[PDB]
């Protein structure tokens, strides 16, 4: 039970490093590198 | 064409040179070579190559 | 199976064995903020 | 990259990895510029994939 909870949490954290088809997996870099009209698409991909 | 590599390497070109004196043990926003983010910066005892 | 007065946690030897036989990565009642900043090698998975 | 605009009568300024508006703020590891002369109708041909 403990290992199941820990591994579920670990996979949840590791999902933050996936690009999800966007340019990058970190929000700050893409927000500072893309104009907001274009960055809407990448932020939306990260959101979903 | 203009090609760049936005990857985790020591940046050689940095654009307009703006430097603010680094503070420690305080909640600040850091922009080290485009590494935008927020946090508390404390000196570390790692073994960076 | 009865509590041991000598033990400071007031737990039976069997209870102590069961507690020591489970590796709780995140016990919860630790209030980890205060030691995450003080890391010498790398932040733990719990800290992340 | 403020000196970009006055150096040419721009016809196509499409950027893929980074918007040209916020281009001075970033830091690039290396910068490579490739120069060539191409025809008119083939400006779409010079593009990824």
UniProtKB/Swiss-Prot annotation, chain C:
Taxonomy, superkingdom: Viruses
Q: Where is this region: Fusion peptide 1?
A: 12-33
In chain numbering, the residues marked as site (Cleavage) are: 11-12
For the region Disordered, give the residue spans.
24-48
* Disulfide-bonded cysteines: 36-47
Where are the residues of the annotated region Fusion peptide 2?
Answer: 31-48
Role played: Precursor of the fusion protein processed in the biosynthesis of the S protein and the formation of virus particle. Mediates fusion of the virion and cellular membranes by functioning as a class I viral fusion protein. Contains two viral fusion peptides that are unmasked after cleavage. The S2/S2' cleavage occurs during virus entry at the cell membrane by host TMPRSS2 or during endocytosis by host CSTL.
Protein name, UniProt field: Spike protein S2
Per the UniProt record, the source organism is Severe acute respiratory syndrome coronavirus 2
What taxonomic ancestry is recorded?
Viruses, Riboviria, Orthornavirae, Pisuviricota, Pisoniviricetes
**Gene name in the database record:** S
Portion of the full-length sequence here = 805 to 852 of 1273
